[PDB]
Scaffold this active site. Structure first.
Site, PDB file in Angstrom:
ATOM      1  N   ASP A 105       0.901  -1.029   0.022  1.00  0.00           N
ATOM      2  CA  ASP A 105      -0.028  -0.104   0.304  1.00  0.00           C
ATOM      3  C   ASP A 105       0.820   1.142  -0.098  1.00  0.00           C
ATOM      4  O   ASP A 105       1.336   1.551   0.570  1.00  0.00           O
ATOM      5  CB  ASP A 105      -0.530  -0.010   1.120  1.00  0.00           C
ATOM      6  CG  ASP A 105      -1.719   1.958   1.888  1.00  0.00           C
ATOM      7  OD1 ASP A 105      -2.178   1.951   0.784  1.00  0.00           O
ATOM      8  OD2 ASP A 105      -2.574   1.139   2.743  1.00  0.00           O
ATOM      9  N   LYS A 163       3.607  10.263  -4.151  1.00  0.00           N
ATOM     10  CA  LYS A 163       2.397  10.457  -4.457  1.00  0.00           C
ATOM     11  C   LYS A 163       1.498  11.165  -4.959  1.00  0.00           C
ATOM     12  O   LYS A 163       0.490  11.091  -6.130  1.00  0.00           O
ATOM     13  CB  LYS A 163       1.399   9.141  -3.495  1.00  0.00           C
ATOM     14  CG  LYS A 163       0.305   8.264  -4.340  1.00  0.00           C
ATOM     15  CD  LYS A 163      -0.273   7.749  -2.408  1.00  0.00           C
ATOM     16  CE  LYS A 163      -1.595   7.150  -3.281  1.00  0.00           C
ATOM     17  NZ  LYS A 163      -1.608   6.069  -2.029  1.00  0.00           N
ATOM     18  N   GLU A 207      -6.982   0.812  -4.540  1.00  0.00           N
ATOM     19  CA  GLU A 207      -7.183   0.371  -3.511  1.00  0.00           C
ATOM     20  C   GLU A 207      -8.431   0.188  -2.166  1.00  0.00           C
ATOM     21  O   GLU A 207      -8.677  -1.091  -1.837  1.00  0.00           O
ATOM     22  CB  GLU A 207      -6.412   2.392  -2.703  1.00  0.00           C
ATOM     23  CG  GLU A 207      -4.619   2.293  -2.732  1.00  0.00           C
ATOM     24  CD  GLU A 207      -4.576   3.737  -2.352  1.00  0.00           C
ATOM     25  OE1 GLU A 207      -5.339   5.033  -1.881  1.00  0.00           O
ATOM     26  OE2 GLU A 207      -3.781   4.299  -3.330  1.00  0.00           O
ATOM     27  N   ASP A 210     -12.549   5.162   2.809  1.00  0.00           N
ATOM     28  CA  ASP A 210     -11.138   6.091   3.510  1.00  0.00           C
ATOM     29  C   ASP A 210     -10.503   7.385   3.842  1.00  0.00           C
ATOM     30  O   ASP A 210     -10.706   7.855   2.720  1.00  0.00           O
ATOM     31  CB  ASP A 210     -10.668   5.160   2.099  1.00  0.00           C
ATOM     32  CG  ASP A 210      -9.185   5.282   1.919  1.00  0.00           C
ATOM     33  OD1 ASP A 210      -8.600   5.552   3.099  1.00  0.00           O
ATOM     34  OD2 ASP A 210      -8.013   4.585   1.647  1.00  0.00           O
TER      35      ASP A 210
END
EC number: 3.6.4.10
Lengths: 112, 377
Positions: free
Chosen positions: B6, B67, B171, B195
């Protein structure tokens, strides 16, 4: 009314106390190196450069003291754990006085 | 053995499926998640916990949030907007962004995928230290909304890190897989993944037909998380100190930091207790600050923020042309989902549906990735 529970807290403080002694040694080593440079034969410009070169170490010492304060700040000491409370206060004040000396060093290197 | 990784904006996690079970691998410092940080010093390059630990000492040369830049053009609106909030420099190299830092006494720049490959190298080495064996295969996850360039840029980071990227999966899909929502009974299942972790907020709605995943819709806030909630508590205590001592500690960075660290910890305490106590000796001008805060107050200070998370939910059900009643499963990923007031605003938006959360929310995605890695290995 001394309790066995307070002993567990006093031991935590003693380990923290030891950690602080170690950081303090580094600050002293750092101070000798500072004076050594000030006393050195380096040309005023490479000197100023060796000094600011010591910037990384003073910042690392400051950071270690801050982590200790953060760890001391996780303790919760009842009003009746007088000895533990006094030990905590004494340690925080010692760390803060070391922090003040670190700041004095930061004031003498990389100009001010 | 293949692993699941992850790759988070601020933390990464790696898991492995062994002996019929998934193991979230602890790193050298015993942490089951590792900071997505890379620091460049006059002498070395640090990655992970070591990098985060010296950020206060070397802010301009410690990179994180790669990211957010990976696979994007410099003129991308996100890039231009995010860089205003980073301590390190982002530069333009032919329309492509690079982070610029001082490394080993020289000025060096790196592409986002290089920085992420460095983080991937750490997760690879972390799994090998645990397994005592080499690691080359892995499934790496990305946000459901990532595009081709972003997906490829992540794949590339894995490659540079010497990894054989079996697949780049979404994800939320990994989270669904972790709970095994793809192996349940019946047919076409509607799943919503909430999330809230690592500094980003993403809501995704998925449809699972005979084990096949289709992403119906995605919604959220790209800059929302625990640090915003902590900051509200800090605002709370700064005001309280002003009321009690008529002193403003806000310009003393060290006092604010000790307070902030104490609040982050109290917040975690308020996820399993109704009140938290804080004792900070000589916080400012020699003044000791002993106080406490209830879960209730914590929630009032974050009222707008917590409530706002439902904005993206309804929008996701909107574009998924579905009704809240048509969602079959609800999954919680991200540390902030541990906040009960978050679980309520949610569970009651879906008028009572139980939520999936027995799996550590910080590790669900890697977990699901490990499962997939094994099946794909």
């Amino acid at each position: 009314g001394n309790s066995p529970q307070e002993e567990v807290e006093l031991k935590k403080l003693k380990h923290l106390e030891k950690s602080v002694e170690k950081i303090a040694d580094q600050l002293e080593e750092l101070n000798k190196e500072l004076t050594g440079i000030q006393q050195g034969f380096l040309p005023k410009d490479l000197q100023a450069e060796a000094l600011c070169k010591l910037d990384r170490r003073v910042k690392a010492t400051i950071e270690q003291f801050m982590k200790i304060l953060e760890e001391i700040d996780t303790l919760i000491l009842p009003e009746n754990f007088k000895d533990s409370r006094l030990k905590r206060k004494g340690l925080v004040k010692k760390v803060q006085a070391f922090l003040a000396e670190c700041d004095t060093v930061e004031q003498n290197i990389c100009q001010e | 053995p293949a692993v699941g990784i992850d790759l988070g904006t601020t933390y990464s996690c790696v898991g492995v499926f062994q002996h019929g079970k998934v193991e979230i691998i602890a790193n050298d410092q015993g942490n089951r998640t590792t900071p997505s940080y890379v620091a460049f010093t006059d002498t070395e390059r640090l990655i992970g916990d070591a990098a985060k630990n010296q950020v206060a000492m070397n802010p301009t040369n410690t990179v994180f949030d790669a990211k957010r830049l990976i696979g994007r053009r410099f003129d991308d609106a996100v890039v231009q907007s995010d860089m205003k909030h980073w301590p390190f420099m982002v530069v333009n190299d032919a329309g492509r962004p690079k982070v610029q830092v001082e490394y080993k006494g020289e000025t060096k720049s790196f592409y986002p995928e290089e920085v992420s490959s460095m983080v991937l190298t750490k997760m690879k080495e972390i799994a090998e230290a645990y397994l005592g064996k080499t690691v080359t295969n892995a499934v790496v996850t990305v946000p459901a909304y990532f595009n081709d360039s972003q997906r490829q840029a992540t794949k590339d980071a894995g490659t540079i890190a010497g990894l054989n990227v079996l697949r780049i999966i979404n994800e939320p899909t990994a989270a669904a897989i972790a709970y095994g929502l793809d192996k349940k009974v019946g047919a076409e299942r509607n799943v919503l993944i909430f999330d809230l972790g690592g500094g980003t907020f993403d809501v995704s709605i998925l449809t699972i037909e005979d084990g096949i995943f289709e992403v119906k819709s995605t919604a959220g806030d790209t800059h929302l998380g625990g640090e915003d909630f902590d900051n509200r508590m800090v605002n709370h205590f700064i005001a309280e100190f002003k009321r009690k001592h008529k002193k403003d500690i806000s310009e003393n960075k060290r006092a604010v930091r000790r307070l902030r660290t104490a609040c982050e910890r109290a917040k975690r305490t308020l996820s399993s207790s109704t009140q938290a106590s804080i004792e900070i000796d000589s916080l400012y001008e020699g003044i000791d600050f002993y106080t406490s805060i209830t879960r209730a107050r914590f929630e009032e200070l974050n009222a707008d923020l917590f409530r706002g998370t439902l904005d993206p939910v309804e929008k996701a059900l909107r574009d998924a042309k579905l009704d809240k009643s048509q969602i079959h499963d609800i999954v919680l990923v991200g540390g902030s989902t541990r906040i009960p007031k978050i679980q309520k605003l949610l569970q009651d938006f879906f008028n009572g549906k139980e939520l999936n959360k027995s799996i550590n929310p910080d590790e669900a995605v890697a977990y699901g990735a490990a499962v997939q890695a094994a099946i794909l290995s």
